[PDB]
Amino acid sequence: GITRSGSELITTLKKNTDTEPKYTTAVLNPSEPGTFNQLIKEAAQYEKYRFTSLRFRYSPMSPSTTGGKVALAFDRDAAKPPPNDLASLYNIEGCV
Amino acid sequence: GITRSGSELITTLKKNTDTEPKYTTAVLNPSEPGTFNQLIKEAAQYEKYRFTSLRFRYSPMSPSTTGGKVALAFDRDAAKPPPNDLASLYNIEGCVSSVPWTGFILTVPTDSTDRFVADGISDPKLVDFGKLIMATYGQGANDAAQLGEVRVEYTVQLKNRTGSTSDAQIGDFAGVKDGPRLVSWSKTKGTAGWEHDCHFLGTGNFSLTLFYEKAPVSGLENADASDFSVLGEAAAGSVQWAGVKVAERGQGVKMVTTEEQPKGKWQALRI
Amino acid sequence: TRLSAPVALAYREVSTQPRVSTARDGITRSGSELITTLKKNTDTEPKYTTAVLNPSEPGTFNQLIKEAAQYEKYRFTSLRFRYSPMSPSTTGGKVALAFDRDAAKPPPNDLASLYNIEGCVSSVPWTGFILTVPTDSTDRFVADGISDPKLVDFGKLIMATYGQGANDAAQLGEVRVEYTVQLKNRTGSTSDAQIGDFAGVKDGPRLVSWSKTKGTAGWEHDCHFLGTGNFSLTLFYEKAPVSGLENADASDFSVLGEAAAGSVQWAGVKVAERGQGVKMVTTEEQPKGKWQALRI
Amino acid sequence: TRLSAPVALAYREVSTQPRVSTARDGITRSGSELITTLKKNTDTEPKYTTAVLNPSEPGTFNQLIKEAAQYEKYRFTSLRFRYSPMSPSTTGGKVALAFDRDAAKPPPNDLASLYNIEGCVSSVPWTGFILTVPTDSTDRFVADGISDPKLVDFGKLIMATYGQGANDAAQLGEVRVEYTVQLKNRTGSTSDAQIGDFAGVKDGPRLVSWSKTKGTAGWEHDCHFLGTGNFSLTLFYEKAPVSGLENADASDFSVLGEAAAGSVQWAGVKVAERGQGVKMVTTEEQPKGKWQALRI
Numbered sequence: 001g002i003t004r005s006g007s008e009l010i011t012t013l014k015k016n017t018d019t020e021p022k023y024t025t026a027v028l029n030p031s032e033p034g035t036f037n038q039l040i041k042e043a044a045q046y047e048k049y050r051f052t053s054l055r056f057r058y059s060p061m062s063p064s065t066t067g068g069k070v071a072l073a074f075d076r077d078a079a080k081p082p083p084n085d086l087a088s089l090y091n092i093e094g095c096v
Numbered sequence: 097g098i099t100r101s102g103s104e105l106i107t108t109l110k111k112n113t114d115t116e117p118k119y120t121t122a123v124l125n126p127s128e129p130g131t132f133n134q135l136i137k138e139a140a141q142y143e144k145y146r147f148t149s150l151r152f153r154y155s156p157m158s159p160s161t162t163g164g165k166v167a168l169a170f171d172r173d174a175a176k177p178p179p180n181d182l183a184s185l186y187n188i189e190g191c192v193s194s195v196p197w198t199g200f201i202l203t204v205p206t207d208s209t210d211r212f213v214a215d216g217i218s219d220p221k222l223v224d225f226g227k228l229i230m231a232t233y234g235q236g237a238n239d240a241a242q243l244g245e246v247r248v249e250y251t252v253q254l255k256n257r258t259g260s261t262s263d264a265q266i267g268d269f270a271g272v273k274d275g276p277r278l279v280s281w282s283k284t285k286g287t288a289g290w291e292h293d294c295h296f297l298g299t300g301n302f303s304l305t306l307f308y309e310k311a312p313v314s315g316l317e318n319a320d321a322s323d324f325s326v327l328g329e330a331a332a333g334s335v336q337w338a339g340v341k342v343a344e345r346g347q348g349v350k351m352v353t354t355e356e357q358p359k360g361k362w363q364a365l366r367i
Numbered sequence: 368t369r370l371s372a373p374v375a376l377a378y379r380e381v382s383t384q385p386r387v388s389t390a391r392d393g394i395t396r397s398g399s400e401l402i403t404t405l406k407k408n409t410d411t412e413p414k415y416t417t418a419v420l421n422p423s424e425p426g427t428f429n430q431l432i433k434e435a436a437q438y439e440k441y442r443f444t445s446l447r448f449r450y451s452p453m454s455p456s457t458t459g460g461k462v463a464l465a466f467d468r469d470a471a472k473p474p475p476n477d478l479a480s481l482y483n484i485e486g487c488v489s490s491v492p493w494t495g496f497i498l499t500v501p502t503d504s505t506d507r508f509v510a511d512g513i514s515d516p517k518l519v520d521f522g523k524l525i526m527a528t529y530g531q532g533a534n535d536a537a538q539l540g541e542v543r544v545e546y547t548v549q550l551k552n553r554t555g556s557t558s559d560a561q562i563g564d565f566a567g568v569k570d571g572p573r574l575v576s577w578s579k580t581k582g583t584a585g586w587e588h589d590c591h592f593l594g595t596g597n598f599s600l601t602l603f604y605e606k607a608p609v610s611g612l613e614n615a616d617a618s619d620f621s622v623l624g625e626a627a628a629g630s631v632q633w634a635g636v637k638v639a640e641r642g643q644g645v646k647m648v649t650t651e652e653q654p655k656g657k658w659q660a661l662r663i
Numbered sequence: 664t665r666l667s668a669p670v671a672l673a674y675r676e677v678s679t680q681p682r683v684s685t686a687r688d689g690i691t692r693s694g695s696e697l698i699t700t701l702k703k704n705t706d707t708e709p710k711y712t713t714a715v716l717n718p719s720e721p722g723t724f725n726q727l728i729k730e731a732a733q734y735e736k737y738r739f740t741s742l743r744f745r746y747s748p749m750s751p752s753t754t755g756g757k758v759a760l761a762f763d764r765d766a767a768k769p770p771p772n773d774l775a776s777l778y779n780i781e782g783c784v785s786s787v788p789w790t791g792f793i794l795t796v797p798t799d800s801t802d803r804f805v806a807d808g809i810s811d812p813k814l815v816d817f818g819k820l821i822m823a824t825y826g827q828g829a830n831d832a833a834q835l836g837e838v839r840v841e842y843t844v845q846l847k848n849r850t851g852s853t854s855d856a857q858i859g860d861f862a863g864v865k866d867g868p869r870l871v872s873w874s875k876t877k878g879t880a881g882w883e884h885d886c887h888f889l890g891t892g893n894f895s896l897t898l899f900y901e902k903a904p905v906s907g908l909e910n911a912d913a914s915d916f917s918v919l920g921e922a923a924a925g926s927v928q929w930a931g932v933k934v935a936e937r938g939q940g941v942k943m944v945t946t947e948e949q950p951k952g953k954w955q956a957l958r959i
Contacts, residue, residue, distance in 0.1 A: 004098055006257075038260050041137050113537075116618070116639045160374045161455045163536035169382075172735050172848050173804065180637075181596035183401045183429040184851025191382040195453055198377040207802075221804050222814060234404060234453055234538035387685050394683055433729050433852050556729050558958045559855065599955075601897055601929060603919050623899050623953075624927045631920045631927040633897060657919075659895075661957065662854045 002046070005053075008036055012061070013070060021071070021089060023082035028054075072096060099148070100138055101251040106131050107299065108157070109166055109196075109232050109243045110344070117233035119178040119185070124150070124170075124225045125214040126252055129276055129298040129366070130345065131228070135252065136276065139213050140261040142254035146211070147225055149251040150204040157244045158196045164234030166243055167193035168202045174224035185231055196235075196243040210255060216277050265364045270357030278302070278364045279348065288313050289354025294364075296321075296342040303367045304349065306336045309359040313352035321347045339367070375455045378495060380543075385430070393438060393551040400428055402448075403595070403641065404541040405462060405492075405528050413463065413481055413527035415474035416641070420446065420466075421520045422548055423509045423572050425662065426593040426641060431548065432572065436559060439552035440506045443521055446546040447499040454539050456493045460530030462539060463489040464498040470520035474527075481527060492531070492539035506551060513569040561660040566653055574598065574660040575644075579652070585609045586652050591644040592617070592636065592660075599663045600645070602632045605655040609648040617643040635663075671751045674791060676839075681726070689734060689847040696724055698744075699891070699937065700837040701758060701788075701824050709759065709777055709823035711770035712937070716742065716762075717816045718844055719805045719868050721958065722889040722937060727844065728868065732855060735848035736802045739817055742842040743795040750835050752789045756826030758835060759785040760794040766816035770823075777823060788827070788835035802847060809865040857956040862949055870894065870956040871940075875948070881905045882948050887940040888913070888932065888956075895959045896941070898928045901951040905944040913939040931959075 016022045026035045028051075030043035043049065056072050073095035075082075083089045112118045122131040124147070126139035139145065152168055169191035179185040186193070194200045204226070214223045230246055265275035269292065270283065279294045279302075296302060306316065308330065315330030322343040328336030340349055385398035408414045418427045420443070422435035435441065448464055465487035467474075475481045482489075490496040500522070508519050526542060561571035565588065576591045592598055602612065604626065611626030612634045624632030636645055681694035704710045714723045716739070718731035731737065744760055761783035763770075771777045778785075786792040796818070804815050822838060857867035861884065872887045888894055898908065900922065907922030908930045920928030932941055 002098065002100055038141060041141070041260065041263075045134055045137070161457070163454050163538065165453045165541075171850060173807065173850070175808065176850070179851050181429075181594075181851075182404070184596070186380075186382055186401045187430055187849070187851045188382065189384075189849035193380050195375065195377045197375065200379060219810060219814070221810060234536075236535075236537035238534065385685070387683050387690055389681070389683050430733055430852050433732055436729055437726055556726050560957055560959050562959060601927075603929060623925070625925060629919070629921060631897075631929045633899060633927045659959070661856055663856050663858060663955070 002042075003052070004039070004042065006039060008038060010035055010056075016068070021083075021086060025082055027078050029078075098138070098142070098254050099251065100135065100254065101149075102135065103247055103249040104131075104133055104135065106228070106246045106248055107230075107345075108245045109230060111235045111239050111241055111243060112164065112232040113235055113237055113239075117182055117185075117231050120230045121178055121227050122230075123174050123214075123220070123227045124248075125174075125223060126254065127214040127276065129278055131248065133298075133300070135250070137263075139252075139254060140263070140276070141258065142256060143213050143258050144210050144255040145213055146209065146253045146255070147206045147250060148253055150206050150225075151249050152202045152204070152228060153247045153249060154194070154199050154201075155245045155247065156197045156199050157242050158240040160197045162196045162239045162243070163236055164196060164232065164239065164243075165193050166196050167191060167229075167231040168200070168246070169229045170202065170204045170226055171229060172226045174220035174227045178229055182231070182233070185229065188229070193231075196232075196239075199244070213254075263365070267362050267364070269360045269362065278366060279304070283356065285356075286352075288352045290356045290358075291350060291352055292358075293319055293350035294348045295346050296340065296348050297345055298366060299342050299345060301367045302340045302342060303365045304338050304340055305363045306338075306351075307361045308332065308334055308336075308353075310353075310355070312358070313354050316349050316351055319348055319350045321349060324349065372456055376452060376494060378451045380451060387434075390549070393549065393553070394434075395444070395547065395549050396431065396434055397547040398431065399546075400430065400544045402427060402524070402542045402544060403526070405526055405539045407531045407535050407537055407539060408460065408528040409531050409533055409535070411478075411529060413475075413478055413529045416526045417474060418524045418526075419470050419516070419520050419573075420522045420524060421470075421507075421510050422550070423511075424593075425572055425574050426595075427524075427544070431546070432559065435509050435548075435550055436557050437553060438550035439509060439554050441509055441551070442504065442506050442549040443502050444547045444549050445502060446544065447497060448524060449497045449543045449545060450490070450495050450540050451543065452493045452495055452540045454492050454536035458492045458535045458539065459532050460492055460528060460535070460539075461489050462492050463487060463525075463527040464496075464542070465525045465527075466498065466500040467523045467525055470516035470523040474525050478529065481525075484525075492528070492536070495540075510573055511557070512571070513563075513567065559662065562657070564655070564657050566655075574662065575600075575658075582648070585648045585650045586654075587646055587648050588654075589615060589644055589646045590658075590660075591642055592638045593641060594662075595638050595641050596662060598636045598638065599661045600634045600636055601659045602634070602647070603657045604628065604630055604632075606649075606651060608654070609650055612645050612647055615644055615646040617645060620645060668752055672748060672790060674747045676747060683730075686845070689845065689849070690730075691740070691843065691845050692727065692730055693843040694727065695842075696726065696840045698723060698820070698838045698840060699822070701822055701835045703827045703831050703833055703835060704756065704824040705827050705829055705831070707774075707825060709771075709774055709825045712822045713770060714820045714822075715766050715812070715816050715869075716818045716820060717766075717803075717806050718846070719807075720889075721868055721870050722891075723820075723840070727842070728855065731805050731844075731846055732853050733849060734846035735805060735850050737805055737847070738800065738802050738845040739798050740843045740845050741798060742840065743793060744820060745793045745839045745841060746786070746791050746836050747839065748789045748791055748836045750788050750832035754788045754831045754835065755828050756788055756824060756831070756835075757785050758788050759783060759821075759823040760792075760838070761821045761823075762794065762796040763819045763821055766812035766819040770821050774825065777821075780821075788824070788832070791836075806869055807853070808867070809859075809863065855958065858953070860951070860953050862951075870958065871896075871954075878944070881944045881946045882950075883942055883944050884950075885911060885940055885942045886954075886956075887938055888934045889937060890958075891934050891937050892958060894932045894934065895957045896930045896932055897955045898930070898943070899953045900924065900926055900928075902945075902947060904950070905946055908941050908943055911940055911942040913941060916941060
């Protein structure tokens with residue numbers, strides 16, 4: 001048994017001129033290179049996990065004169081394709 | 097902060113058929129590849145530690161008809177060289193010895209001070225918690241090849257946190273080296289020319305990649321490694337990729353250039 | 368009735384903690400040390416290995432030597448030797464421990480005489496036994512130079528092995544002292560580095576024992592080391608010798624120096640078994656010079 | 664009211680008995696030692712004499728060094744220095760004792776700074792005073808080689824004298840330690856003979872401190888001896904030096920050897936006051952060789 005806490009960096013979002021959302025997903029498993037860059041090394045030594053706590057912080061980097069929007073949502077199914085319209089995106093529980 | 101108890105295999109002691117006892121040491125630091133094979137990965141991401149509980153175990157592997165003895169002592173000064181005579185070893189505090197065919201334990205009292213995870217260039221008296229001394233002596237020619245295995249059952253408290261240290265030890269021929277201390281090079285002039293040979297401080301399957309700016313005298317060659325297989329091509333401006341299996345510390349490979357400090361680059365990994 | 372025989376016996380040895388204390392006249396130190404490991408002897412007659420019982424004796428004591436350098440007299444209030452087997456139960460021969468109260472008399476020459484010594488115990492190599500020697504109430508001077516061993520030394524332990532087969536364990540066991548000494552008086556701390564010339568002068572702990580032997584090339588002086596460990600030996604020749612320092616039967620001998628008039632050598636000898644040493648050759652019996660043994 | 668002034672004060676000093684005892688982790692040794700005797704200084708500015716507080720320091724401790732050679736860590740549970748006057752009441756000037764918790768910082772340069780040190784006591788040369796230094800609960804490694812003094816040394820005592828007249832007592836007093844150390848851990852007895860090359864390597868008790876200084880003839884290496892007593896110094900030159908060993912400011916210096924490639928010298932230096940030493944000259948900065956200091 002072991003309990004660890006961390007704060008990784010998933011990715012940096014990019015501008016999208018088109019008014020339709022452009023999605024970029026990130027599967028949430030400890031042994032996922034796309035999501036975790038440091039937890040993978042210690043997850044390779046274990047074969048089970050349980051996320052006691054979990055949060056996703058968006059830290060702005062753009063000037064104050066940039067429009068558009070940025071949305072973070074959590075889909076409890078890791079195989080479902082990302083939604084195809086804004087309404088479906090906002091229907092996801094907890095989307096902010 | 098993170099507490100990580102566990103148990104790991106340091107090495108397996110081997111027959112000492114000669115008369116002088118043989119001493120093998122393993123510095124007790126979480127970043128030492130000689131003693132740790134799994135806690136090193138976790139300690140790469142932390143820059144402080146404290147051994148809440150430490151203890152060593154000897155598991156027999158030899159027949160019941162094996163002579164000689166094996167000893168296990170802990171020295172709190174990681175800088176001191178290994179003892180020179182058996183009496184001094186047996187004078188160390190808490191030194192436990194027994195016949196090879198029976199197992200024993202050695203509990204190490206631990207203090208409540210924090211030390212920086214080793215970087216390889218700092219004073220051992222400042223970073224390391226101590227070292228372990230394993231002695232084997234008094235074995236005849238009819239004894240088994242292997243006597244037993246030494247293991248460490250610990251409980252460490254890694255503190256703070258930082259950027260993960262590189263898993264591969266990149267370096268440069270006769271120059272700078274970065275990453276975990278997996279290998280160490282040495283040079284000795286010879287008939288053909290300057291001979292550069294590396295020694296693997298850890299035990300396991302490695303992967304050594306090399307790059308020659310100028311054509312060397314000879315390519316990678318087994319020196320005393322258990323297994324070996326090169327898949328490159330020695331030549332000017334080429335790279336040689338090799339896989340070396342190490343059973344005991346100090347085994348490695350070699351090369352020849354005839355030019356001291358040749359221009360190139362090497363990479364070591366524990367696959 | 369029935370009495371079984373194991374394949375082997377395992378003794379667990381843990382380094383205990385010395386018990387030091389202060390008395391009216393001095394201190395009373397108790398502890399345990401390791402003398403040596405007995406080796407196989409595939410011959411009927413015994414082969415001996417001696418260890419003089421006296422604090423400040425590097426061969427016998429390793430830690431009590433330092434604590435006895437600050438004191439002048441001693442009295443072994445209780446000492447006792449123990450044997451730990453490390454050989455299977457299929458090893459023949461025997462192991463004998465005896466305590467000779469005269470520290471100069473050479474070990475006996477035949478097995479019959481070895482058993483006449485009072486208190487001589489013995490047993491099979493694969494079992495442990497203890498030899499406890501009665502002590503007395505006489506104070507003796509800690510060894511400091513060339514003096515009669517009858518006057519300073521308390522005694523001498525004798526360890527013998529014999530009767531082992533050809534295909535037997537290389538080493539049979541190891542002896543271990545268990546003393547309780549009474550150090551008395553006090554003095555300025557004394558250095559530990561035997562120093563003396565070739566005319567029979569010695570000043571310090573007994574680390575070396577020279578021995579002349581006439582030869583065709585010249586008188587050969589053999590520097591036998593009583594202990595086992597790493598030593599250094601500086602020599603100063605007043606007259607040019609036949610040869611410098613050479614490795615006689617020791618292990619890992621290295622010398623930095625030259626042989627000539629007024630020259631000085633410096634040999635880092637290393638000893639794996641008590642008795643090994645180096646040698647030198649000169650044309651002059653009892654040559655003029657100096658030497659200095661140290662435990663480095 | 665009235666307060667008389669004697670012609671002189673007599674302190675009776677009797678060598679007490681060290682109190683050794685055994686604890687769970689090690690031993691607890693109490694005792695008293697003599698550091699040095701202060702000398703007259705007929706100048707307004709101070710003249711300093713330092714003594715590093717650490718067991719296995721030959722300059723400071725004479726008997727605790729031997730008892731600390733068997734142990735690895737220490738903790739001064741209680742230490743305190745005392746001053747015994749041996750000068751009449753007609754001597755001017757002053758005597759100052761201070762304890763610098765940093766063992767590498769050089770002694771101050773002016774009297775004003777000397778009095779800013781915490782705990783700095785002082786008095787007239789003809790009366791006795793005690794400086795008691797608060798201790799802590801941190802274990803430190805007994806000195807074993809070249810290491811940062813911040814990490815191993817507990818501190819450094821500083822003794823200063825100044826303001827004495829021309830026709831005053833030659834020596835004013837003498838300092839005396841009174842410690843209670845807690846030695847812990849344990850290890851095979853370590854030899855007492857500093858050994859190291861000229862590249863900055865040292866292994867053993869701090870008996871010597873080399874110091875380069877560029878000169879017209881070549882780089883001069885001065886072998887300053889931190890203690891006071893009889894020493895021996897073996898040197899090995901790999902390359903022929905400009906000159907061998909010469910007496911710089913010590914007393915009774917004698918050397919048996921020659922200066923040349925591969926040659927070895929052997930100097931029995933004698934020191935009457937801490938800091939005296941010998942010297943040698945070479946044309947190569949950081950020369951290749953070895954040296955070995957010993958207390959013989």
